[model samples]
Target chain A: GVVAAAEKTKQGKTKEGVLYVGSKTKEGVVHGVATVAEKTKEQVTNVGGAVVTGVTAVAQKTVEGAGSIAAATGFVKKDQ
Target chain B: GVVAAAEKTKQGKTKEGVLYVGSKTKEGVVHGVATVAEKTKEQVTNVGGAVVTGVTAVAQKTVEGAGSIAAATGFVKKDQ
Candidate 1:
């Protein structure tokens, strides 16, 4: 969905454009999830660790986004 | 420079906004550097391995960005 939003900008056709949009999207999504996680952690202190764990899940997603953007912009060779 | 641009967005005051902007900046910078690294690699084909090594440097920057975004948005404790 984020990428789709980025695609709508059509900057995806340009390398720098795609990179900018992709990173922006990743940062937004991860941070958004993290905020919700913080609130959830606060409401249920006993599950704080789990909440943080949930937040950390975004790290992997971030990595995936990096790889995807890299591939899309022809920085890395695509895996078949 | 990218962070400054994001700050210009004033989305930095909001958690999700900061996260999004930060990630976008990180992605943009890393990929921009990677693209340059790729070109440098192509021109100096014999040093291709070194070029890829240079690109890999962005991975660390990516991690740092992740940490910074996490801290800025209060997802993680700040390191002194």
Candidate 2:
């Protein structure tokens, strides 16, 4: 199985103070099953004592494939 | 490869609904190993905006230097 949909957000220390950006599911869980990459990126960023976001969909899409995981997807809107 | 596991939570408009902050993976997908982060912080009130949780994972070492693909992975998780 694969991700029906995915999303993520990040709070990191920018040149400023605390920078927060995020995204949410437009709908409930798609439940097609997925691998998840948001935590992975956060873990890496935290390791460097930094925080981050964006490109998570890239990971999810790559993980899923060229829109093949499932038909019903929450479709993450990252522009928020 | 990246993100073996992941999760996220958010709060938009509160005071009139259920506020949820959640995380999964008591020990499953990780199998041999995975990634997750949890830091519970209480908010003063609840105006509305969001409380985000995001982290991919500290990628495995590049092994001195090597290409990546057909490795081991799965958009693995999101939405739900």
Candidate 3:
């Protein structure tokens, strides 16, 4: 049969009927893909500057003096 | 010598040395490993509604009425 081969990306592809990340004949490893790729290396967290969930509670206590729901997640640059 | 290899929580590995999240083997059953897996089903966009840019320039005319600036990022659940 004639092959309709690729011209663009060689990424995440297969050879023969076998797909391998490294090399075939290599028996190779395999599995289910992840929902999230851990960015290979850890990126600086909260790059977008996510606010803590309890922000409203703290702000209320400081000005209105009532609630004291200590914030759990502090703002940073990744979680956004 | 012997070939030591595995895939599992076998965490990060090399055997039958590599670990797996799913049984994954299915070339009949030896298919692959984890990385960035797509979700099984399609989802609703903005389940945590994302904000549209440039929403505030008009809101400013109502209150302060001079230096009308719009909010860039908004306080929504998803991108928050």
Candidate 4:
């Protein structure tokens, strides 16, 4: 086998695999691998916290509103 | 001194520390902690994905709607 090796996006900003949120690792520290957490810091507030469940709930709805807002008010560009 | 030991929440639902989302890890796969993801599975749908930015937008609004529904219709418990 030719030295199997590969890489991913530097910021890791793409969705193409299984994803999770609000969990920890073997080290017993809390962490995750995307902007959902980073961006969530600013986006999500007042909630005790979130499991991907709760977080996704809010995110999905929020985005839909954004899309809806964009759709209704032309806030964001829509392709198709 | 001991190497250092830590014990975080089992599901990692607490928001006492840092967090991220929508990104990838060294393994080049998608994963996270807590019920947010699990709940999100059911809560969030039809969206190709999220960036924490968009997801949070909708989620906040949705939760607000939830809150409004709760406040008006008496759904989730709320205390102040």
Candidate 5:
């Protein structure tokens, strides 16, 4: 007989925000998922958060890098 | 012992685009997650957008960063 496992469940996206320089405001989120036992559920949530964190960091770094070039080229004030 | 939460779910694969300098057009997407509540629904959408925005920035940064380096090395004319 095939054993049916518990259904997977998801919890959702929460947000973080702040204004950025030379661009619009910045926003970030953490998403969560879970299934079966409480342990499995926790892991899912953690993974979602990790992914969100990873994505956010990379994005911000890229944007900031471009802004540096703009500043260097006098596209926007260096101090501003 | 715990009560079951509403089934978790996802909605996404949305996209945004724009042309970049020294690089061609760029596209981005948002992936959302939701729980039981209406408030939760909005949060999921916001987070998806956040993640997408983050990735887009990072990718653009890499492209622009390389371009900047090339220009500095005189590979591409500085004024161009």
Candidate 6:
């Protein structure tokens, strides 16, 4: 999705796919796309950010919280 | 970062920067890059996805949790 948008932007067909990414203005759309692409790349490559890891960690925490609630409600077996 | 990687992949320079994005093999790297680019685009464009909104909501929840901790510890004034 981001690549296609970038290609459009690079090819001078800039406003169509770029404006829907929550950017309030044309320049903001361009900037938003760039930022999203950069951050996604960083997380994917494990180069400069731990966003992927952070997200997964949070997901795991949510699972544990849910398990606790289930145990309290007697909806699941409590192993410990 | 994601956009740059996609450009590299699309340009047929397919192995250098692509392999570093957590893919175990060349094919996996290509797939990973594609997936990252697509998902990022989806979240950015708000097209068929709510990842951006979900993330911001989680962040707000974190802030509220932190505020609760601070109140419990008497580190800040808690009204109501």
Q: Give per-candidate clash totals.
A: 6, 17, 33, 32, 1, 1
- The model with the greatest TM-score is 5
Write candidate 4's Cα lDDT for B1-80 as tens digits: 11111122122132233223442222222244222322221121122223232222123323211110000111233333
Query: How would the candidate models be sorted by lDDT, starting from the highest?
Result: 5, 4, 2, 3, 1, 6
Question: Candidate 3 or 5, higher lDDT?
Answer: 5
Question: TM-scores across all candidates?
Answer: 0.13, 0.13, 0.12, 0.15, 0.17, 0.13
- Residues A25-53, candidate 6: write the lDDT tens digits: 11110111123243331121111111212
Write the residue-wise lDDT of candidate 5 on A1-80 in tens digits: 11111222333342333323232334533333212232111111212111233223334323211111110111222331
Cα lDDT for residue A65, candidate 6: 9
- Candidates in order have lDDT scores of 0.18, 0.22, 0.19, 0.24, 0.24, 0.17
Q: Candidate 4 i-RMS (Å)? A: 23.7
- Tens digit of per-residue lDDT, candidate 2, span A1-80: 33233233323221222222233333222211122343222211112111222211111101211111121223234442
* Each prediction's DockQ against the real complex: 0.04, 0.04, 0.05, 0.06, 0.05, 0.03
Q: Give candidate 6's error at residue B10 in angstroms.
A: 48
Q: Give a tens-digit lDDT track for model 4, residues A37-79.
A: 2212112111212223322222432322111110011123333
- Candidate 1 chain B lowest-lDDT run of ten: B44-53
What DockQ score does model 6 reach against the true complex?
0.03
Query: Model 4 residue B22 lDDT?
Result: 46
Off by over 4 Å in 2: A1-6, A9-80, B1-3, B12-80
Q: Cα lDDT of model 4 overall?
A: 0.24
lDDT of 5 at B51: 34
Candidate 6 lDDT tens digits, B5-65: 1111122121212111111111111011122333332121111111221111121112111
